[PDB]
Design a protein around this ligand. Structure first.
Ligand SMILES: *[C@H](O)[C@H](C[C@@H]1CCNC1=O)NC(=O)[C@H](CC1CCCCC1)NC(=O)OCc1ccccc1
Ligand SMILES: *[C@H](O)[C@H](C[C@@H]1CCNC1=O)NC(=O)[C@H](CC1CCCCC1)NC(=O)OCc1ccccc1
Lengths: 301, 301
């Protein structure tokens, strides 16, 4: 028993992290087979990053402008190219630690593990959710760019996030591994800000099911609402509408606890209106929305 | 910026996890050089574990009663022995992934990362504190025994916890890697319960410093208390007394924020007496005590 915020074991991804240096800038790259993936803003000069033209900047580079270090051994770049906001560096050595992997673009509300790295060296691992406003609430310092987020599915590593920048509110923005930003953000230093967030309803409900599986029942009641009357409550408290798809995704947890989804919704409704009154749920005094139904199943059985 | 509950990267420890089978019981072992470490209760029968005599049980075993699998390749045991509550299995193959490592017995209040495993295979990683009552609030299912807790210090893995059992309140108890239980617990199925806990004061204060470094200042005030008058408040709210040693450990964080420890204590005092009034600190609506001063420094610079 017990319920903790859990990341995937990071070993398979640790073997892929390298350091990429271009001129004065250093950040992390992902070394998969004979290609290194990293943010394209590594080729930005400190002056020409208010509005850079990346196709010109890259045409003016050559393979010897890029220094790649796997551990201590230097990697020689034999080709370079750009795909959206990621730079791709062909190296002469295939990574012998390359796992089975996929590139996946995730939906808001999904979670992943982040392996924060500095200078090619993994520093720590933690779990993150893609917020509805396409930011993540990470923990990233200077030099963390190129750190990746990932999920694991029977030794296949699904990479889904590469880190590029911090927004003014302290939250973070980046791309999928094919270089497309999540959300409306762009890789130039301008006035882009995170939009207003909403709470991921299906995750809050999954977390309430984890609380039930772990013995916290004080918030249950006998009431049952309908979908339509619940979503009116969600709108008032800035929660994502509950869809039929979400109800069905919650099925296994509903079956394991014997509490129907719409029964669990009438408990959430009471919590939103009356608060917790000094009680906690799974060690928290607020409603938590960064556990997917999948995360709950994986940890509660 | 940002502050997240962060585990150490688990790769160095993943390469050490094996599966140990004795009769009908299966749990995880730690394969370091040519020795496998696991809980000694793996040799317990389901009937003779209300009060077992482990020296007799082990005398009645032979090397072929133990099955060790590293991945898929079976390991042959060429020796066995017992040290306190851990079993040690000599195998004929040294682990070629053996990192630089130490065995360390930690103090309450210290944190470590837990690599939860089932059947020798790492499942997830999370951070834990040794509570003052020598339990940990983990997340462990059947078959998790032998999962280890560890810290990393420049590629030297310091193992400090091996998992043995769940207590009635859902918290967890285990040993150091030399087989000595943390706390008063013993490895037989009896009526042992966790004692009353206390909050780790020095950690709460480190977490308040992390909040300041990250822009949460609404709880600061101009008051400054003394050590003696603070510890009277700690006693009333079930907090560990603040020692002079703790004050000095908080020095670097005090220096980085320019807020003296005894200044930060007068903010904690106000929070304990008046609560948060619907505000949060680093995304939490209660005071958090599972970040050491070291964890804060490592993540805030
Ligand atoms: C890459 O390593 C950093 C990571 C940032 C710095 C602190 N926390 C992070 O997540 N990325 C950058 O510094 C960005 C570089 C720009 C990105 C757009 C194209 C040109 C280059 N800038 C950035 O994140 O700006 C905000 C910021 C906040 C706090 C400290 C520094 C910068
Ligand atoms: C080993 O893999 C398990 C891990 C436990 C089970 C669920 N969560 C855990 O942390 N350990 C055990 O099952 C213990 C075995 C005993 C330990 C004392 C010596 C004889 C063998 N027992 C145990 O933890 O009992 C409590 C319990 C709670 C919930 C489910 C099962 C057991």
């Amino acid at each position: 028993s017990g319920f903790r915020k859990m990341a995937f074991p990071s070993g398979k991804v640790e073997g892929c992290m390298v350091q990429v240096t271009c001129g004065t800038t250093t950040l992390n790259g992902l070394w998969l087979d004979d290609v290194v993936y990293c943010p394209r803003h590594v080729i930005c000069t400190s002056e020409d990053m208010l509005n850079p033209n990346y196709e010109d900047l890259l045409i003016r580079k050559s393979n010897h402008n890029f220094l790649v270090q796997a551990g201590n051994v230097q990697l020689r770049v034999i080709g370079h190219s750009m795909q959206n906001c990621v730079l791709k560096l062909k190296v002469d050595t295939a990574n012998p630690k390359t796992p089975k992997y996929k590139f996946v673009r995730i939906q808001p509300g999904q979670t992943f593990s982040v392996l924060a790295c500095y200078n090619g060296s993994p520093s720590g691992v933690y779990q993150c959710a893609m917020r509805p406003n396409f930011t993540i609430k990470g923990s990233f310092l200077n030099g963390s760019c190129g750190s990746v987020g990932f999920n694991i599915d029977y030794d296949c590593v699904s990479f889904c996030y590469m880190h590029h920048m911090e927004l003014p509110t302290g939250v973070h923005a980046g791309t999928d591994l094919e270089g497309n930003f999540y959300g409306p953000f762009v890789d130039r230093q301008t006035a882009q800000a995170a939009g207003t967030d909403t709470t991921i309803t299906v995750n809050v409900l999954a977390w309430l099911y984890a609380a039930v599986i772990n013995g916290d029942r004080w918030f249950l009641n006998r009431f049952t609402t309908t979908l339509n009357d619940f979503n009116l409550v969600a709108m008032k408290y800035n929660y994502e509408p509950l869809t039929q798809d979400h109800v069905d995704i919650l099925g296994p947890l509903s079956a394991q606890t014997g509490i129907a989804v719409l029964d669990m919704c009438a408990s959430l409704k009471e919590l939103l209106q009356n608060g917790m009154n000094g009680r906690t749920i799974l060690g928290s005094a607020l409603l938590e929305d960064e556990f997917t139904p999948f995360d709950v199943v994986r940890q509660c059985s």
